Amino acid sequence: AMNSVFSGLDMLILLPYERRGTRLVVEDYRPDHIYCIGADFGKNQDYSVFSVLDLDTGAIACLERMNGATWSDQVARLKALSEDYGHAYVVADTWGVGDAIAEELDAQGINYTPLPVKSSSVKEQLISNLALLMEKGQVAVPNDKTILDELRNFRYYRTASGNQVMRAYGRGHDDIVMSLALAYSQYE
Ligand SMILES: [Co+2]
């Protein structure tokens, strides 16, 4: 498409995985590597997505996705995933998550850093970084059609004033896109 954000999708490294319920597992924990997790939370029927990135290789080791999970279950699953990957630190989009989730991240002792996606400017920095890394052949994700489709359908639009917006085509989702961008915000 003319308005595609990820014009370098052809450079994406596609990784086999095992589907273990809500997790797509590419690689189990490598203790000699350091990891982080990009985390998008779901309000109401929206998807939550947690993307585990190996910072030593630049590859997604695990991606967990679900909808309809309770707020506490979203935090608990994130905790488990962090623990599974050596207390991997979480890059959490805390914007619009609400008091309960913010309090629970602290109360549960989660290793996390807030990165609130609170404006088009922030979103554009995150996405541009992902897109730049992707075109350089540095992004490697589970070879899953749902993931690739969401990237494929992430597009450019304009606001009434002529400002750039990035969003899903049609009435689609971008929780996977955003989780990935949050993770890759940490990758050098
Ligand atoms: Co979302």
Author numbering: 255 to 442
Show me the paper's own sentences about this structure.
The large terminase protein is a key component of the DNA packaging machinery in tailed bacteriophages and evolutionarily related herpes viruses. Typically, in addition to an ATPase domain which powers DNA translocation, the large terminase contains a nuclease domain which cuts concatemeric DNA, generated by rolling circle replication. Crystal structures of the large terminase nuclease from the thermophilic bacteriophage G20c show that it is most similar to the RuvC family of the RNase H-like endonucleases.
Only one metal ion, bound to the site A, was identified for conditions containing Mg2+, Mn2+ and Co2+. This metal ion is coordinated by the side chains of D294 and D429 and four water molecules in the canonical octahedral geometry. The nuclease was active in the presence of Mn2+, Mg2+ and Co2+ but inactive with Ni2+, Zn2+ or Ca2+, consistent with observations for T4 gp17 (41), SPP1 G2P and HCMV UL89 (18). However, G20c nuclease had minimal activity with Co2+, in contrast to the high non-specific in vitro nuclease activity observed for SPP1 G2P nuclease (comparable with Mn2+ (39)) or the absence of activity for the T4 gp17 nuclease.
